[PDB]
Nucleic acid binder design. Structure first.
Length: 65
RNA sequence: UUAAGUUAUUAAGGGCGCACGGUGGAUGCCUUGGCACUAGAAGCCGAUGAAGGACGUUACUAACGACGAUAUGCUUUGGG
């Protein structure tokens, strides 16, 4: 998910998306550990999604001040 | 046949010369790194936590670089 859609989302939606993305990342890591993950690029994709979500959240809580 | 006399051949190995190899890294050529300077700029950083480090971050990750739990990177504005 890109920064444009992230900015479309609302703050509560940003937090929920961060939670679900972190849960997905955890599941991906566990599959990788157990040897059940072939599509390894998903880990990096989700990591960058989380980074973008947090970036937009920080932008909002900065511009509020 | 005898006697007297003379002189070879031998190379175990060695010497000189020659040929062919090996080892070794000189020499020639080369440059990625240095050395001395010129002109211009700049001449401080730090409790808003520095210099320098430790430990981590990748699908696989021992090391250097980069980066910092938003980690082998995030947003934005321009270039291409």
């Amino acid at each position: 998910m890109k920064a444009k859609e992230i900015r479309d989302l609302t703050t509560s939606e940003i937090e929920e998306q961060i939670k679900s993305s972190k849960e997905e990342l955890f599941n991906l890591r566990f599959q990788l550990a157990t040897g059940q993950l072939e599509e390894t690029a998903r880990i990096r994709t989700v990591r960058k999604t989380i980074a973008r979500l947090k970036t937009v959240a920080r932008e909002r809580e900065i511009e509020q001040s």
